[PDB]
Each structure stands twice: as C-alpha cells, then as structure tokens.
Amino acid sequence: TFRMRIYERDDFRGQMSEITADCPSLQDRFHLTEVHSLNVLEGSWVLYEMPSYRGRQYLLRPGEYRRYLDWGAMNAKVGSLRRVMD
Amino acid sequence: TFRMRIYERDDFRGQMSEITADCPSLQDRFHLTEVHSLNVLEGSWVLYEMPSYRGRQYLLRPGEYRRYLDWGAMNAKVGSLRRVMD
C-alpha cells in the first residue's frame, strides 16, 4: 500500500513507471533525471531533489500532480523517493 | 498516536510543549517563531518553514532532534507542523 506512477511528460503523458518501494536513486534505477507528472495512488511519500534522500524535500499525499508546480517544486528534477512509514 | 515535544532551547533544555494534533501556526499556539530542539515520540510529521504549511519542508520521523541541523534545516525558523496521514 505504497504505489505511485511517474511520467516522462506533463499531464500523465509518456511512458509510465510504477514505484512501490523507496528509491535512493531514480537515475540509476529508472534512468530518469526529471519527473514531469506523477500520480500517488497509495500512501504518502517524500520527494527529494537529490539522490540518497538529500536536498529540498516535498511531501506527496494521495492525489494527482500533473506538473512539477503542483508539488511545489521549483524545477522538474528529483533524485530519490521515500515512503513515509516510520 | 502522534506526539512530540517542542523546546525553544537546544538539547531538550528548558520549557517543553507537547502536541498530538496539527498546528497551522506555532506563533499562535505557543508564541513560538523558532524551535531549537524536539523529540518526536510517535508518528511522522512534516515541519514547515512558514505558517499554514508553506515554505521549505522537512520530514520528521520518530526520534530525537537535539538541534535544528538534525532535521536538515539551515535555521531554527518553523511555522507549522502536520501529521503525515493522507
């Protein structure tokens, strides 16, 4: 019950990648260096600007985010994703 | 099952305030503009730089943060606190 989908393009367009675990490095695993849209289907996650959980943080609660501005980021870059459990 | 203690001073010194609910403004609730140390007993919370959950965000999971540097901030400014639920 931690499931989200990230897209190559804005508004849920482009290839999709479903993430169900923490990811210390989006570039190494998914070869993504920018997430343009995302849909948080289950659970809250924290999106990090840099790899290994570093840099500006942005909380992600269940819902749709069709553009990086929606999660309050200044750019579409993201280095790691983490699930909020404890 | 959410709970934390907030101190205006470093290393858990001095006056302590306990919270179990969200708080849009720490200035209003406790006449606080800066928090210098905290102990997150239960739950995961997001601490915001400014009131009404706005500004830089910093995730706090159960644990002891004896000084602001410990939750990644570059200053002790904190405006609101929210429990990570949904």
Curated annotation (Swiss-Prot), chains A, B:
Top-level taxonomic group: Eukaryota
Ranges in coiled-coil conformation: none
Sequence ranges assigned to domain Beta/gamma crystallin 'Greek key' in this UniProt record: 2-42, 43-85
Notes on the domains: Has a two-domain beta-structure, folded into four very similar Greek key motifs.
Protein purpose: Crystallins are the dominant structural components of the vertebrate eye lens.
Similarity comment text for this entry: Belongs to the beta/gamma-crystallin family.
Stated name of the protein: Gamma-crystallin B
Gene transcribed to yield this protein: CRYGB
Whole-protein residues included: 88 to 173 of 175
